[PDB]
């Protein structure tokens, strides 16, 4: 079986850009994006990039980027303003075929989206926050001065309140 895991569903972002970073300790099947609260991104459920095979996955798939090797660090960005997505590898933007780094793009806001991963057999990689800022790897030579917020900074927060 794969393991899937995901932010908690609470989290899900409905605006504003968020970065997170995933490293892929082996270099095998696994795939990182962003999923709807409610074969990662072979349906309308999540967008996510495929490190090993090199391909961008939502609804189907396409050749976009490079793979990863062990110990390599990927970069997620969303902006749920302009509906966009991006990817970067060690810091390095990911490209599609057409070269453009929209990795997916026009995307409806529904109901927000959460960080997610899928691990396959015998593979390991971690999701960071960066609940601690000073552990992301890649986020100071893209991300921060983009303007994308780590996630875990939406997440701190655990109360809530009404009337």
Same mark, same amino acid.
């Given at each position: 079986?794969?393991? !899937? ?31 709807? %609260? ?23 798939? =396409? ?29 390095? !933007? ?6 453009? =780094?929209?990795? /997916?793009?026009? /995307? ?6 959460? %960080? ?22 890649? /986020?100071? !030579? ?7 917020? %780590? /996630? ?12």
């Amino acid at each position: 079986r794969f393991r !899937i895991f995901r932010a908690e569903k609470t989290y899900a972002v409905k605006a504003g850009r968020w970065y997170f970073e995933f490293e892929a300790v082996t270099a095998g099947d696994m795939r990182v994006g962003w999923s709807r %609260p409610g074969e990662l991104g072979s349906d309308d459920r999540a967008f996510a990039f495929d490190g090993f095979k090199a391909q961008r996955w939502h609804q189907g798939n =396409e050749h976009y980027g490079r793979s990863w090797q062990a110990g390599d660090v990927v970069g997620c960005m969303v902006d749920m303003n302009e509906h966009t997505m991006m990817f970067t590898l060690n810091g390095e !933007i990911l490209l599609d075929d057409s070269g453009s =780094e929209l990795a /997916f793009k026009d /995307f409806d806001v529904g109901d927000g989206f959460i %960080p997610v991963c899928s691990l396959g057999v015998a593979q390991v990689g971690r999701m960071n926050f960066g609940k601690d800022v000073s552990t992301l790897k890649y /986020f100071t !030579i893209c991300g921060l001065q983009e303007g994308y917020e %780590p /996630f875990a900074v939406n997440t701190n927060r655990d109360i809530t309140m009404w009337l």
